[PDB]
Amino acid sequence: SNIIKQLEQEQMKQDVPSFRPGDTVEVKVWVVEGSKKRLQAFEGVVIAIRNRGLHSAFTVRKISNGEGVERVFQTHSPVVDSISVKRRGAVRKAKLYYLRERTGKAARIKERLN
Amino acid sequence: MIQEQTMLNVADNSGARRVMCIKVLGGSHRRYAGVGDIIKITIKEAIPRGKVKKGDVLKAVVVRTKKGVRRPDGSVIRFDGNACVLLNNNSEQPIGTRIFGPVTRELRSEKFMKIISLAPEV
Amino acid sequence: MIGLVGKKVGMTRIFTEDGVSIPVTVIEVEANRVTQVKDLANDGYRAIQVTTGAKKANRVTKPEAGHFAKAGVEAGRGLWEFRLAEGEEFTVGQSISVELFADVKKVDVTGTSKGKGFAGTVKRWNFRTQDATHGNSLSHRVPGSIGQNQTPGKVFKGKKMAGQMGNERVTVQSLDVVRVDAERNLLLVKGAVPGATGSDLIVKPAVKA
Amino acid sequence: AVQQNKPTRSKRGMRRSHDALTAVTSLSVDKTSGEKHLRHHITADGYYRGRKVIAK
Amino acid sequence: MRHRKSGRQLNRNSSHRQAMFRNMAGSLVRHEIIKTTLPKAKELRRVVEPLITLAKTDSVANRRLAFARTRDNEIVAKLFNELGPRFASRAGGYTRILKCGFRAGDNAPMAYIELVDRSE
RNA sequence: CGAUGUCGGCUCAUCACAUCCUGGGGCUGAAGUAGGUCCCAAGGGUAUGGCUGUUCGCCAUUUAAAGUGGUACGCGAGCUGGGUUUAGAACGUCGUGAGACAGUUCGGUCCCUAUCUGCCGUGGGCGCUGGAGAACUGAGGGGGGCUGCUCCUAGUACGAGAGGACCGGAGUGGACGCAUCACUGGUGUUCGGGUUGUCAUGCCAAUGGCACUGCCCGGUAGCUAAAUGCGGAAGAGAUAAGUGCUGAAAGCAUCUAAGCACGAAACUUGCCCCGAGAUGAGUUCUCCCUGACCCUUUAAGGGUCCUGAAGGAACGUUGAAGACGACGACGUUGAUAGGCCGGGUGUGUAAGCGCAGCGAUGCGUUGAGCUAACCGGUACUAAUGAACCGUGAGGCUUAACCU
RNA sequence: AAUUCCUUGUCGGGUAAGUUCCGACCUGCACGAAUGGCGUAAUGAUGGCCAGGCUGUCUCCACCCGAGACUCAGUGAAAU
RNA sequence: ACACAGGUGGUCAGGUAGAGAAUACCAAGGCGCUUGAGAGAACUCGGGUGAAGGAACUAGGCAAAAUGGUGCCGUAACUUC
RNA sequence: AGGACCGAACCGACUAAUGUCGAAAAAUUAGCGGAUGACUUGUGGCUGGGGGUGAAAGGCCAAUCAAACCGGGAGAUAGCU
């Protein structure tokens, strides 16, 4: 809709680096602890990307000190601050859910390297 | 998304391995327990010489759910297993000492400063 | 006090500074204009009749046209009305805008719910399903007993059964207004109002507070 | 699941009240051939709004 | 409750459904005019018309699609050669629907469907 | 006894008050907290499992509370068939035996397309007094009414101390209900792709058919929840139990007989929905029609010719509207539906061709190719001009005002 | 106990909780030796019970694909 | 009793894959089952899928889901060996 | 070798669902048991009603069984409706 869309691009952020599923990403979060407005990091591979304009959002899986944690992220959310790609993976499927039932050597993805 | 009969995992060296949720606490006819909830659990699998033993019935708080949680932004944090922290069946005060895995920011309610003081993540 | 007559335009969300993703309904509210004003002199109650939008010459009837002509305001599809509260006043033709809400805190939305059509009890009244196993026969989702026996020997009026869900002039209350943009006639509320995008909605100030 | 008393003539008359089958009560004459046909229907011969479409 | 949905079930399981349209496809092209029940006709448009759009641009790739769909070597020949150029100008609306009456035995509302050109 | 299907469970409930919880009070062997007991009060709420055919009961764990009964020990033309309550068989026991036992044990067909009442929805006809179109008032009816916990007042009042408030204010919960897809997901046999077997398109290549969509992977629109908003109320009137003021009868005393004031989730409102078939059929605004003539038991009469208005209906395109009707939008003066163009979305580097490799295959061309329902536009196609229904100024009496 | 009315006997195990189950106890209402007693590998569309797996059985149901149900046309019953 | 989803002995019996007369796809050959057209409500029958949990269901894991093939490895109590 | 194992034809009929004025007066769909034997089947024979036959249920004996069907005693008798 003319209404909605004009209204949409109002909040849609611009400086979003392009990336594809399977690309290892570093994400910075505006986490706040009462007063301490910190900028915590979070690095896991991207396993799915949703492109719905202002509602676009991706998700990353990180195997940290224990077991897997799948955290989605509203792309244009102010809570996320920075997005740096670290390694561009070479997969050939939009959604990588199948990573869930595998771990370690059984998991490691390829490298795209162009 | 924990409820009765759910079979969780212990998030600390408390003395057990695997447990079972026999009762959600708080409110009549409560259906589900999530990250910040206290549940009555029995013990289904103890560690040979732990501080507890198979067949005990004590309160516990879950810390991770496969169902995940939701923040004021719309994001969610789905873990890969259902994990809980044991408590004394009389006065909460976590039993174990060291806690494995991360937990969540939505657990600080002042009566768990012991917990978040131990969490190695989030 | 008197509200306006917007239109459901879709649903969106507003990212606050902290990231609180307030889901909002975008209700376009054109400049409603007064056509007829009623008074205690004739009708015993004081109220104003408004309109919005526009019709087509080939679809605007003779009776309708004359009524508008009496007010000199172009035919806007529909003719709603609002009871006054005696603390105000109005004159014919006034192109009232969304300016009213730019000062309220909470408002109330009225509209026609989605037409689910003929719907069974499980969906209409959340009746609990019968066991779909253990020998159950042909009665997996039927209502189940609806009376007692010879003593009352009849079905009590008001009994919940299957029928038509929807098209009800439902009303939500206490909805928080998020932001108001007069620029393109935008009333942004927090919540989820009744109707299908493109269906008219009556908004007015929250009563309870 | 059966009637108790046998319904009378009066009743089935009332039941059959709405079974009236109204006729077309509307006939369209072609602007060119001057034939009777249903609105938005090619003529029996095969013309339509002046045109000779069916060719048969 | 099919709100906002689209398509037509036509009392036919899908495999059976896509079957006839493919068969009904060539027939509409092989003869350039056919008789059929109206509801079907309205639906047939949503298939054959887009097919013509395909043929407009001749290409080894397209030809294969025209064979992938409609599984007809002949219609492909009838396409890309005659129907392609003839409709070069028109933007859509490659078909016409005419109400013709009711089928004898079962009062099915027949209707004619024919290509817009239909003129030698 | 020419048939009233009988326990329990599931489902759906509805009423009573002899009230489990929540509300308001009196007394106390009531300090406070927590209770005992009695009075008023039926609005709302009023468990999850283990064991048993179980009602019951016991136990484990909760909860503000896990009420007591009536309703053919509610409810089989709604389900179940465990129990009981046939025919088989065995144990104990009784009997010489055939057999027998609220003694036991294993197994053992539960039919019915709804005429009427009722009830949930939704239409047609006519009435509403000339007709038509919209908008309402509003009698009356219905829905909803639950409550925890934490914090503040305040570790204050009380109290040896331990413990630990009333009143009042704020936040956050559980259960129930309503609305909605923005977010998270489900589905998504009309979208993309991988792949087994086999058949066919002359063969390669490339595709299609069938095998539960062949098996699978993801997936738009819708729909939907576990997802996301909001709701219960505050206030007012009249009271119950109860507390009172003044105050005689009865020089006193006394809440009462005069008079006056307080006082609960109950009652009437307040909030939401239906609703003028409310025949007591209401009100407002606007629109349309103001021609001749015979007959007669000359009567709110019958009849003929010429006109048929507003509007409606029918037909077609149709819809987040829909079982059918109905309801909303559109009908060339057009964006109503399909298609087309562009974009989005999804799937994941098509085909063809060149190169390396013995080959399977990889690489470049290429984030290409293909895209359902989605968004913005575009009359290319289809929504034909007319005809059909509907009239030609609207009774009598009386009164108040204009002639 | 396929047998025990009392009886859900008492004790132990299994379960957060076990009138069923498994092991003992003898107080055998009213077991008992070819109307056989007591064991028993294997077998069994056999009775009871527990555990792993798996799952819409269930919390609590949602969506979708088809065949009826619904409408139009032809034919056209029945119990009562 | 019917142009009725039932019952009726023997004989012949190709290709591909497959242990196979199973089964999947075909050949020869023979059929689309003698009411159809629309719509795409509740509800019923057959089906498919399903977040988290996983027998809490229930008289009872009834029903479904699930396991499923060839070859090598390995395999207890008990036993009439 | 086997009243041996697995599993089609064949034979049988444990469970669930549908059906119940049914497609059918006992079947269907999906799974279940046996499957070289006390097996199963075609054709023709023999046994007849207080009799037959029975791996025994009072089971079967032409949709009929604690005494078949058809005709006759016979208009049995009916303190009952």
Side-chain angles (χ1 to χ4, degrees), chain B residues 1 6-7 66-67 82:
Chain B
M1 183 244 287
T6 314
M7 268 290 261
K66 210 177 190 299
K67 187 73 174 188
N82 308 291

Side-chain angles (χ1 to χ4, degrees), chain D residues 22-31 34-50, chain E residues 38 98-103 107-111:
Chain D
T22 177
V24 70
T25 321
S26 54
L27 204 63
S28 66
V29 190
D30 194 62
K31 73 164 185 173
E35 308 187 298
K36 307 300 182 65
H37 68 96
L38 288 172
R39 293 277 285 186
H40 308 56
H41 271 64
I42 64 176
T43 54
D45 189 64
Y47 283 106
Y48 185 62
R49 294 186 60 183
Chain E
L38 181 157
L98 314 177
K99 283 67 69 170
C100 65
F102 292 107
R103 207 191 309 176
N107 183 274
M110 291 299 207

Side-chain angles (χ1 to χ4, degrees), chain C residues 83-180:
Chain C
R83 300 287 291 299
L84 300 177
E86 195 172 61
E88 70 266 75
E89 192 64 61
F90 274 119
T91 172
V92 182
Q94 283 195 182
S95 180
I96 196 164
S97 182
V98 70
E99 302 302 292
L100 291 62
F101 300 121
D103 193 58
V104 299
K105 308 295 182 175
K106 302 175 180 177
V107 297
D108 303 307
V109 188
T110 305
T112 306
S113 56
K114 283 202 177 182
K116 304 295 175 57
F118 206 101
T121 56
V122 186
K123 192 179 179 297
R124 191 175 174 179
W125 311 93
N126 310 297
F127 279 25
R128 303 227 288 287
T129 306
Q130 289 202 60
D131 309 296
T133 195
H134 291 304
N136 178 298
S137 298
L138 324 175
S139 53
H140 308 316
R141 306 168 58 81
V142 288
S145 170
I146 66 190
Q148 304 57 46
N149 211 306
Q150 191 170 302
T151 292
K154 67 182 178 185
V155 176
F156 297 104
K157 187 181 303 177
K159 187 67 173 55
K160 299 169 179 53
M161 296 189 272
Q164 172 76 59
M165 233 199 291
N167 286 290
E168 184 182 57
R169 179 168 172 285
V170 284
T171 293
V172 285
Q173 300 191 296
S174 299
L175 290 173
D176 300 301
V177 57
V178 184
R179 183 275 297 302
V180 289

Side-chain angles (χ1 to χ4, degrees), chain E residues 5-8 18 20 24 40 42 45 53 57 63 79-80 89 92 98 114 119:
Chain E
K5 303 194 65 185
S6 183
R8 263 193 178 66
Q18 283 73 76
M20 59 178 66
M24 200 175 258
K40 291 186 185 64
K42 288 181 174 297
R45 298 186 300 178
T53 313
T57 51
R63 309 296 290 289
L79 295 173
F80 306 108
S89 60
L98 314 177
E114 62 181 61
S119 185

Side-chain angles (χ1 to χ4, degrees), chain A residues 1 3-4 6-7 10-11 37 54-57 74 76-79, chain C residues 9-19 26 28 179 184 186 188:
Chain A
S1 187
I3 304 81
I4 301 176
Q6 294 176 294
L7 186 65
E10 304 293 294
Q11 306 181 65
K37 183 176 294 301
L54 179 64
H55 318 307
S56 63
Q74 303 305 300
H76 309 300
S77 189
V79 68
Chain C
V9 198
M11 187 169 272
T12 64
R13 58 173 168 179
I14 305 304
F15 290 115
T16 61
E17 178 282 292
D18 77 277
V26 182
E28 184 286 296
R179 183 275 297 302
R184 44 192 76 70
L186 288 183
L188 292 166

Side-chain angles (χ1 to χ4, degrees), chain A residues 43-57:
Chain A
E43 187 168 303
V45 65
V46 176
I47 62 172
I49 320 174
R50 173 197 177 74
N51 293 301
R52 254 38 166 287
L54 179 64
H55 318 307
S56 63

